[PDB]
């Protein structure tokens, strides 16, 4: 099976799995929207109202396509959607990993200018070590993320669901660490009482902070913002004694570092559109719909598994 | 769908929401459940503070997912 799309299944699977793409009319919300042409890239499926066509349902003037992803490891309730991870790709280009230099699949492709690629095993390691060391980066607009391993500029992962690679317990830890980091960057504080750690955003010019709330919300500890001990009027007395990528590999691990198949019906040759695997024969007397990848007539399987490639 | 709102303590509030629900609406439902006025609430997803005029779907927050609640002390 050729899978173009990876999702996170949150039960039954509870893991990153091959995904199935599907489309519905945005108005009637039925699988009635036939597209003029298939999606060719991730923007086509992720940005609302980007793609258009015709609702086959007659009691509907719908024209706009709504794309959604389901897990590919089992049948799903029609509305049992999973989050797509648009950075993950099948390694159809045989690109080496920036860290381990192996040709693995699937891979993650960073949105740096170089489009550096890392295998999902090395991405996991990156995430775990950086989460354990609290070296994830906080951006006020993007949240708790990681950049390209090469440290390229403007390369923080935007879709934070990619951190689902970490697994359920570690994902929760990531979100916990992210919240704490968000608080601290806002000039807030965490309650220092063991078993609490409540996030508090007090006035910037206040030294006494109370862990406010009832027995449900807060613990009532009043602390000094400076030393993080209980509030006091003196100087702070607490003392804390501090105990305490290769360039060649990076060059090769770039995503952008023959292709003629005859049409099954009319046999006029065609080269790939790059992305869309859904061919509609451009010859006016044929117009056979077929899959580039499989050389077969178009079907729901090719649709779900590899409507487009990267 | 359900979202879980958690304090950094681990205390969990269960809400029934829709993707189209605003963060302000989420705060209203928190007010109703815990009696925290919306003004005193700050909601965070994956390290990002959520804006009141944005929807859950704007942040791609999925069913069963968890928002972190932090308190604004004035
Ligand atoms: Zn699944
Ligand atoms: Zn329709
Ligand atoms: Zn890079
Ligand atoms: Zn690797
Ligand atoms: Zn506390
Ligand atoms: Zn102090
Ligand atoms: Zn043809
Ligand atoms: Zn196919």
Residue numbers in the entry:
A (entry chain C): 142 to 385, 393 to 405, 413 to 465
B (entry chain D): 1 to 74
The authors write:
Parkin is an auto-inhibited ubiquitin E3 ligase activated by dual phosphorylation of its ubiquitin-like (Ubl) domain and ubiquitin by the PINK1 kinase. Parkin is an autoinhibited RBR family E3 ubiquitin ligase consisting of an N-terminal ubiquitin-like (Ubl) domain followed by four Zn2+ binding domains RING0, RING1, in-between-RING (IBR), and RING2. Like other RBR-family E3 ligases, Parkin binds to an E2, and ubiquitin is transferred from E2 onto the catalytic C431 residue (on RING2) of Parkin before ubiquitination of lysines on target substrates. Furthermore, C431 on RING2 is occluded by the RING0 domain of Parkin, which inhibits Parkin activity.
To understand the conformational changes upon mutation in the basic patch on RING0, we also crystallized phospho-Parkin R163D/K211N/Q347C (3C)-pUb complex after treatment with 3C protease, which washed off pUbl-linker (1-140) from Parkin core (141-465). This complex resulted in better crystals diffracting up to 2.35 Å. The overall structure of the pUbl-linker (1-140) depleted Parkin R163D/K211N/Q347C (141-465)-pUb complex (hereafter R0RBR R163D/K211N-pUb complex) was similar to the autoinhibited structure wherein RING2 was bound on RING0 and REP element was bound on RING1. Interestingly, we noticed interactions between the linker of Parkin and pUb from the neighboring molecule of the asymmetric unit. Water-mediated interactions between linker and ubiquitin included T410 with the carbonyl group of R72 of ubiquitin, and T415 with the carbonyl of G35 of ubiquitin. Furthermore, E409 formed a salt-bridge with K413, which could be required for maintaining the structure of the linker region for ubiquitin binding.
